[PDB]
């Protein structure tokens, strides 16, 4: 469907996604732990009934009818974790995730009260500006004709070389500022 590395979802991935969503919806509909455990064992037995199959078309519309049945028997209000999207606490503290580059706009009066941290930040900035050239040199040659086919990035190859395009992942803001 829409994945970063693969261009499609295989049959195994579809089955596992259906199993996980079915377990989540069954846990939502079966609030008490023991009823949920019993019906999870029943659902695992039902899934293992058709595990050993040799015809791909049979697995195809078996998965179609299973997804239709799961759509019919879903919870209208499924349980959502607080940090998951759609939850009550989703992307809340993202309002407080101030990016690091704003620290480059501070006054020298308020930069003098954190000397050591700003010295270490200067060292990190120097490391970034000396690693950018060799990281783009690494990414230029490794890229084949027509650009990269997948979104996966090559890792660090030579000793002393940082991975390409690493700044906006390593220096991303913390979860709890």
């Amino acid at each position: 469907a829409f994945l970063p590395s693969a261009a499609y979802l295989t049959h195994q991935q579809k089955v596992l996604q259906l199993y996980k969503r079915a377990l989540r919806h069954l846990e939502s509909r079966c609030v008490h732990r023991d009823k949920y455990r019993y019906f999870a064992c029943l659902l695992r037995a039902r899934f293992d009934e058709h595990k050993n199959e040799k015809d791909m078309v049979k697995a195809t519309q078996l998965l179609r009818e299973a997804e239709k049945e799961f759509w019919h028997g879903q919870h209208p209000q499924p349980y959502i974790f607080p940090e998951s999207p759609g939850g009550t606490s989703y992307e809340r503290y993202e309002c407080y995730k101030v990016p690091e580059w704003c620290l480059d706009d501070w006054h020298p009066s308020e930069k003098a009260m954190y000397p050591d941290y700003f010295a270490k930040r200067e060292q990190w900035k120097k490391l970034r500006r000396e690693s950018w050239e060799r990281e783009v040199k690494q990414l230029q040659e490794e890229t084949p004709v027509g650009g990269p086919r997948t979104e996966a990035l090559p890792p660090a190859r030579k000793q002393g070389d940082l991975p390409p395009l690493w700044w906006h992942i390593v220096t991303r803001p913390r979860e709890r500022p």
């Binding site: 940090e83 998951s84 979860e175 709890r176």
Partner: protein
């Protein structure tokens, strides 16, 4: 309120949750054990184990990331990078 967590505690809790599983044994369970190659389980067992840690730690791990959490050290790595350990 909201006590911090350490990486040693993270692997202790993950091995604690793993060691209560009835399709696993507490003898050859280690932190560098592949689930199907070195331990011998199923893919259904893999997704159900991922769901077990999702219920344990209280947050949802997406399926695209869930397919690759294949060893207990990799699960500890994903929890470590999610929860910003060693601050």
């Amino acid at each position: 309120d909201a006590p911090p967590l350490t990486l040693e505690g993270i692997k202790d809790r993950v091995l604690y949750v793993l060691k209560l599983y009835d399709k696993i044994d507490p003898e050859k369970l280690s932190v560098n054990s592949h689930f199907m190659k070195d331990l011998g389980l199923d893919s259904l067992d893999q997704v159900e184990i991922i769901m077990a840690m999702e219920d344990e730690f209280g947050f949802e791990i997406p399926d695209i990331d869930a397919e690759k959490l294949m060893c207990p050290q990799e699960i500890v790595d994903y929890i470590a990078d999610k929860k910003d350990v060693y601050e």
